[PDB]
Symmetry: C3
Subunit: 254 residues, 3 copies
């Protein structure tokens, strides 16, 4: 059973990576509107990131005796996302950073933000639509779209965790811009793995409002402000701390 349970989980994620890769190839051959192409690529990139993260989290909770096993898979798939999702953010907090600490206009930023939000809801539905066709034994429940409360620490602790992780990732994302592309993807994948390892036991270390929407949508519906604070406000506060540090403090300090 576990032989079929594990193979199906990896197979679906590799299927999704190939399926969104083909969709990117197809879109790149019949989408000559720059705004429309920006929307579709962001929709595909967010869908891949959400579905793979959904499967990775489900794999982890089915394998509690080997926490280090999923850590390598988290690194592997973070590296895969970097190599295949070039030119996208798949993160609303990343879009605010490029609009504020960068040259991204609000016109293209609004389209990317919308594409991420539609993809996050679509990824959850496809996540719920999948796992209902049979396949894995644990997929039969399909999580029953039941809130699991990813955050167990206090409200203040979770906000600090998400703000610091958002600050740590996006500052590196901003500071690795001039770095060689191949090296940068490996560095960001390593940083993502550390943040997940550091924050996964406390908050889940999402620092991604769109990804948190797909993972914990039913948690959001039950208690909106508490989840909206931890996963939408706190990561956005890490981006604001980058503005204060890298636009006001450091330029004046040096």
């Amino acid at each position: 059973s576990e032989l079929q349970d594990t193979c199906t989980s990896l197979g679906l994620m590799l299927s999704v990576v190939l399926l969104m890769g083909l969709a990117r190839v197809v879109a790149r051959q019949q989408l000559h509107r720059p705004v429309a192409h920006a929307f579709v690529l962001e929709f595909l990139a967010t869908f891949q990131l959400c579905c793979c993260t959904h499967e990775l989290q489900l794999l982890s909770e089915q394998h509690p005796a080997h926490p280090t096993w999923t850590l390598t898979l988290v690194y592997f798939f973070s590296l895969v996302h970097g190599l295949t999702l070039v030119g996208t953010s798949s993160n609303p907090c990343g879009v605010m950073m490029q609009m504020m600490l960068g040259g991204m206009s609000p016109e293209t930023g609004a389209v990317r933000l919308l594409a991420q939000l539609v993809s996050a809801l679509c990824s959850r539905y496809c996540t719920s639509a999948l796992w209902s066709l049979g396949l894995t034994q644990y997929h039969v429940s399909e999580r029953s779209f039941a809130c699991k409360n990813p955050i167990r620490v206090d409200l203040l602790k979770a906000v600090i965790t998400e703000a610091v992780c958002s600050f740590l990732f996006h500052s590196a994302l901003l500071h690795f811009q001039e770095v060689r592309t191949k090296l940068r993807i490996h560095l960001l994948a390593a940083l993502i793995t550390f943040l997940v390892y550091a924050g996964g036991s406390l908050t889940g270390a999402v620092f991604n409002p769109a990804l948190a929407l797909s993972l914990h949508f039913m948690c959001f519906d039950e208690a909106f402000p508490q989840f909206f604070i931890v996963y939408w406000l706190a990561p956005s506060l890490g981006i604001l701390l980058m503005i204060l540090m890298f636009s006001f403090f450091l330029p004046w300090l040096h």
Copy 2:
């Protein structure tokens, strides 16, 4: 209580970073003597590193159920030190490396070493002077300036830990000189976090004679040679191993 306990701890460290940042700005505007400016900046940089590390260690022991939570804060503040303390070492072992494996003259090296030692004692006093004004509930004890014996492993194990960590950090510090500044700070912050994670449970992973003086001054007074060996001799032995490896062995090997 824990909501006020945690907020005060972060608030003080961010206060110190801003307060030493302003002092650096003020010093940079009224200190035209190059030797005097070198002393003050090293005093401010060592004070910030000692006070933040004091608060981080105190936060960690108050939060034993979430060891990964402090790990992100350790990374965050290591990154902050790299961004704000440019041009300083805040490490006596780093000064020996620049005097020996570098062009730093003993004239400027002696001033930096003194500034670190005055700052380490001043940081401890300000650490003891603080926490006595009330503020946090656990601050009321203010650690009671009581030896906590940071090293529990055998004497040989702790010496190896401090020598290897000093070798690992300072070799990277030497080898990341040509690396882009923004990338280098992120890499050294990650390395610091690993060494603290790897060595914190055994020695504390200081590899910094000045920082160890502030953290464990009362431990030093009770048993000097044992702490002087682990925290002053062993880190200095890691620098010597770098001289043997990178000046004698490797040049002859290649």
Copy 3:
């Protein structure tokens, strides 16, 4: 006893690094045949990597209460191998990568593969020949050349672990080619440490057919196909996945 037990373990590894360093220097002064020089250097590099890994694993199992202590030593010696074993692979899977995803001819690749295999068997014999002269208390058993079954996870889990680790390391090895040499060695040492930390509790995280031959030769003899699948097939499958990803998928995707 443990003071002598630990000092002997570090002393032998540093002795081997110096002894293979001198042999490399001697070979570089009396070997004018390029094929012969390629064989000897690969034999010396594989011997150093196998013997140090043998001692590191033996140190780790003698020190179960301080798992983080050996992690720093694993990083330290991985960094040492990078600095002293320049121009070699010490990995059969690395040789396939250079023959397939690179310009290494099969003529020089076959000599390197043979040199690794002779060294792995010679390292095991010298490992068994050593520890029989007395020295450490735990060396007296000298592991009794008894199978320890490094893999406890299921067959499917171990194959995934070795394939992913081989993919993760060798893709970074391929993508760090243009990176500065000094930075690259530090990055690969960090990646090796993570893979060992991530995979050591499940498989041992070898992703090195030659190294696995020396470590678990008696395990190989007892149950060949099961160990040949995990340590020879699975790492070679990670290299094949790199070919599919970096020669077929990514070029067509972008």
